[PDB]
């Protein structure tokens, strides 16, 4: 049980990392998609 | 312009300030926004009295983007979107690596189709090429972090 | 001031419009420098024109100081 | 020339002149203003030989 | 949706590889369709619809795996969602 | 990548597949001469061996 709790510590750390990275990556995706096309779509309109 | 006759021997004048488009068949890919004709005379240090003449006609064409938007941009955006989902997919599933690697494979198979459509003109990177590079680096970073 | 100009055909001496005083001569090569020599541009300007790396430019304030190379000042 | 040989025609490079001195044009002539540079290849050298 | 959301399940594998197959078809289809931009072919509209739906199914598979793989050591179960999924939905 | 993930061979074999795709792409762009291996071809061969 002690070893399982020690492993669950790492698993929880990994889950928190996952939950941070999900938002970070979605924000990076949308910002990167905007940063290319926004200027040319503004010039077009 | 006249190839051999110079402006002191044969003089060419534009019939009208703009090309005649009254018979123009509409293109399925390009819209001619503007057209104009200009007569240029140039004098050379050999010969003050023999100007050389040309008429330059130019057409400002804007591409219709719909084909590339539909067949290129949309699947790249879809692959980009799926890249983030690997971080919500739990590790215990074992599907994280398969998901990210299959997204990378699909992106590479799509690059195999995109490289032939993108112009090979190496003066500057196309905007779609920069977007492809962004998507590739994004997937690579996602795999490393995963 | 009066400067030679290539705006008219043939080159002629024309008094500068008000606000421009400097005569200039610009010469550069093109595809026909094999026989015709450098292109020549003559005019008057309010300031000495800019020069591309392949364009020779000369600027002077005197009258008729920008002749065609085949014409004397 | 295939119709004429070195006995019939003598080929030579064009001579130009500057400052009353002639010189042979030993290079491909390129317009510095109107030559649209190619999209993939930069011309580094362009000699000519007889 | 019939592949178990359990260890050994291959839900995401299937969905992503079917999307890859659809991308191979997109390569194949793009050789036949002309390059004009006046309109979008019916086959092209169907292809894009299929790809969008496939990405939605990938997202749903990821969500379902994220739900099933949870553990009491990591997630506190919401009683409202518990009642809705286990009681209200069967009663609906 | 940990062995308990059960995905270690998948990554390597998929990268081999991607390198195969790149070799398919590049080999269509060059003449099949025997004078030398192109630099990108040497890199591809070395990468596939590794
Ligand atoms: C897309 O790309 C194309 C090129 O591929 C580009 O085309 C250029 O378009 C611009 C304008 O948009 C052009 O600029 C104009 O050029 C005119 C050329 O005129 C020549 O002749 C003039 C004298 O002739 C006059 O009189 C006769 C009969 O009386 C008549 O037929 C002529 O039309 C004209 O009225 C001469 O003055 C002029 O001068 C050039 O050369 C002299 C010396 O060599 C030099 O001093 C000048 O600087 C100039 O290089 C030339 O020989 C020109 O008339 C016209 O002038 C207008 O503007 C100037 C200042 O802007 C005013 O002073 C004047 O009153 C006029 O309003 C103007 O300069 C350019 O030549 C085109 N170039 C080519 C290669 O085609 C398109 O623009 C691009 N389009 C995009 C990106 O959308």
Q: Is B2 left (phi over 0), alpha (psi -120 to 50) or beta?
A: beta
DSSP characters for B13-28?
A: --SSSS---TTPPPPS
DSSP characters for B64-101?
A: -THHHIIIIIHHHHHHHHHHHHTTTS-GGGSHHHHHHH
Q: Residue B60 CA: which ligand 1 atom is closest?
A: 83
User: Contacts by E2-6 with C-beta closer than 8 Å and gap 24+?
Assistant: E5/E64, E5/E65, E5/E67, E5/E68, E5/E69, E6/E68
Residue E31: is it exposed, middle or buried by C-beta count within 10 angstroms (0-12/13-18/19+)? exposed
CB E24 within 8 A of CB E47: no
CA geometry: angle at A39 spanning A35 and A40, to 5°?
120
Residues of chain C with Cβ-Cβ distance to B53 below 8 Å are none
Euclidean distance between CA atoms F49 and F20, whole angstroms: 12
CB C23 within 8 A of CB C61: yes
Q: Three-state SS for C25?
A: strand
* Residue B54 phi, psi dihedral angles, 5° rounding: -150, 155
Euclidean distance between CA atoms E52 and E61, whole angstroms: 14
- Residues forming beta bridges with residue C3, ordered by sequence position: C14
Residues framing ligand 1 (Cβ under 6 A): B 38-41, 56, 58, 60; C 6-7, 41, 43
The DSSP call for residue D47 is B
Q: How many domains does chain C have?
A: 1
CB E25 within 8 A of CB E47: yes
Asked if omega into A18 is within 30° of 0 (cis), the reply is no
State the smallest CA–CA distance between residue B35 and chain A in angstroms: 19
State the smallest CA–CA distance between residue B39 and chain F in angstroms: 43
Residue D17: is it exposed, middle or buried by C-beta count within 10 angstroms (0-12/13-18/19+)? exposed
Euclidean distance between CA atoms C51 and C55, whole angstroms: 6
Cβ-defined contact of A22 to B84 (cutoff 8 Å): yes
> Which helix (H) or strand (E) segment is D18 a member of?
strand D15-18
Closest Cα to residue E36, out of B71, A33, D35, A26? Answer: B71
- How far, CA to CA in Å, does F27 sit from each of B65, F32, F48? 31, 8, 15
Closest Cα to residue E25, out of E52, E44, E5, E3? Answer: E44
CB B116 within 8 A of CB E30: no
CB F2 within 8 A of CB B91: no
State the smallest CA–CA distance between residue B48 and chain C in angstroms: 7
CATH no. for residue C70? 2.10.60.10
Residue E81: is it exposed, middle or buried by C-beta count within 10 angstroms (0-12/13-18/19+)? exposed
Residues of chain E with Cβ-Cβ distance to A12 below 8 Å are 73-74
Euclidean distance between CA atoms E74 and E77, whole angstroms: 10
* CA B7 to chain centroid: 38
Q: Residue C6 CA: which ligand 1 atom is closest?
A: 43
* CA D47 to chain centroid: 7
* CA B14 to chain centroid: 32
* Residue B16 phi, psi dihedral angles, 5° rounding: -150, 160
**In a mutagenesis test of the E interface, which of B85, B97, B100, B114 is the best target, namely the one with the most E β-carbons within 10 Å?**
B85
Residues of chain A with Cβ-Cβ distance to B76 below 8 Å are none
Closest Cα to residue B100, out of B139, B72, B127? Answer: B139
Q: Three-state SS for D33?
A: coil
Please, what is the angle between helix B74-85 and helix B95-117, to 10°? 160
Around D22, how many Cα atoms within 13 Å sit in the side-chain half-sphere? Answer: 5
Cβ-defined contact of C31 to D14 (cutoff 8 Å): no
Closest Cα to residue B110, out of B87, B89, B139? Answer: B139
Could you tell me the distance, in angstroms and rounded to a whole number, from the CA of residue B40 to the centre of ligand 1?
Answer: 7
- How far, CA to CA in Å, does F17 sit from each of A3, B74, B108? 40, 25, 10
- What lies within 8 Å, CB to CB, of B63 at 6+ separation is B29, B30, E37
Q: Three-state SS for D23?
A: strand
Residue B74: is it exposed, middle or buried by C-beta count within 10 angstroms (0-12/13-18/19+)? middle
Rg over alpha carbons for chain E, rounded to the nearest Å, is 19
Q: What technique determined this structure?
A: cryo-EM
Q: Give me the resolution in angstroms, 1 decimal.
A: 3.0
Full domain range(s) for residue C5: 1-73
- What lies within 8 Å, CB to CB, of E22 at 6+ separation is E47, E50, E51, E54
CA geometry: angle at D6 spanning D3 and D7, to 5°?
90
């Amino acid at each position: 049980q002690e070893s399982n709790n020690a492993a669950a510590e790492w698993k929880y750390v990994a889950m928190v990392m996952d939950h941070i990275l999900l938002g970070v990556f979605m924000l990076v995706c949308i910002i990167g998609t905007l940063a290319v096309f926004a200027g040319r779509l503004i010039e077009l309109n | 312009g006249t190839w051999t006759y110079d402006g002191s021997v044969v003089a060419i004048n534009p019939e009208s300030d703009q090309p005649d488009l009254s018979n123009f068949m509409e293109s399925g890919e390009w819209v001619i926004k503007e057209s104009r004709g200009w007569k240029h005379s140039v004098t050379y240090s050999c010969c003050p009295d023999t100007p050389y003449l040309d008429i330059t006609y130019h057409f400002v064409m804007q591409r219709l983007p719909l084909y590339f938007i539909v067949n290129v941009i949309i699947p790249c955006l879809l692959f980009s979107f799926l890249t983030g989902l690997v971080f919500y997919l739990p590790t215990d599933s074992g599907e994280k690596m398969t998901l990210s690697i299959s997204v990378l494979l699909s992106l590479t198979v799509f690059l195999l189709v995109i490289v032939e459509l993108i112009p090979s003109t190496s003066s500057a990177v196309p905007l779609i090429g920069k977007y492809m590079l962004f998507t590739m680096v994004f997937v690579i970073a996602s795999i490393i972090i995963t | 001031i009066v400067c030679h100009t290539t705006a008219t055909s043939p080159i002629s001496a024309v008094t500068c419009p008000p606000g421009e005083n400097l005569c200039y001569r610009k010469m550069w090569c093109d595809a026909f420098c094999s026989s015709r020599g450098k292109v020549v541009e003559l005019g008057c300007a309010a300031t000495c024109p800019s020069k591309k790396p392949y364009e020779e430019v000369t600027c002077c304030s005197t009258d008729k100081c920008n002749p065609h190379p085949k014409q004397r000042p | 020339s295939l119709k004429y040989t070195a006995k019939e025609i003598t080929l030579s490079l064009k001579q130009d002149a500057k400052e009353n001195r002639t010189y042979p044009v030993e290079w491909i002539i390129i317009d510095p203003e109107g030559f649209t540079e190619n999209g993939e290849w930069e011309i580094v050298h362009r000699p000519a030989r007889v | 949706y019939f592949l178990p959301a359990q260890a050994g399940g291959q839900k995401c594998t299937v969905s992503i590889n079917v999307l890859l197959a659809q991308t191979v078809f997109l390569f194949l289809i793009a050789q036949k369709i002309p390059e004009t931009s006046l309109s979008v072919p019916l086959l092209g509209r169907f292809l894009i619809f299929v790809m969008v739906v496939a990405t939605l199914i990938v997202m749903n598979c990821v969500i379902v795996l994220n739900v099933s793989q949870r553990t009491p050591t990591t997630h506190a179960m919401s009683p409202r969602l518990r009642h809705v999924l286990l009681e209200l939905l069967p009663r609906l | 990548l940990p062995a308990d993930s059960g995905e270690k061979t998948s990554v390597a074999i998929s990268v081999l597949l991607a390198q195969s795709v790149f070799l398919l792409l590049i080999s269509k762009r060059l003449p099949a001469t025997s004078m030398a291996i192109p630099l990108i071809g040497k890199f591809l061969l070395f990468g596939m061996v590794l």
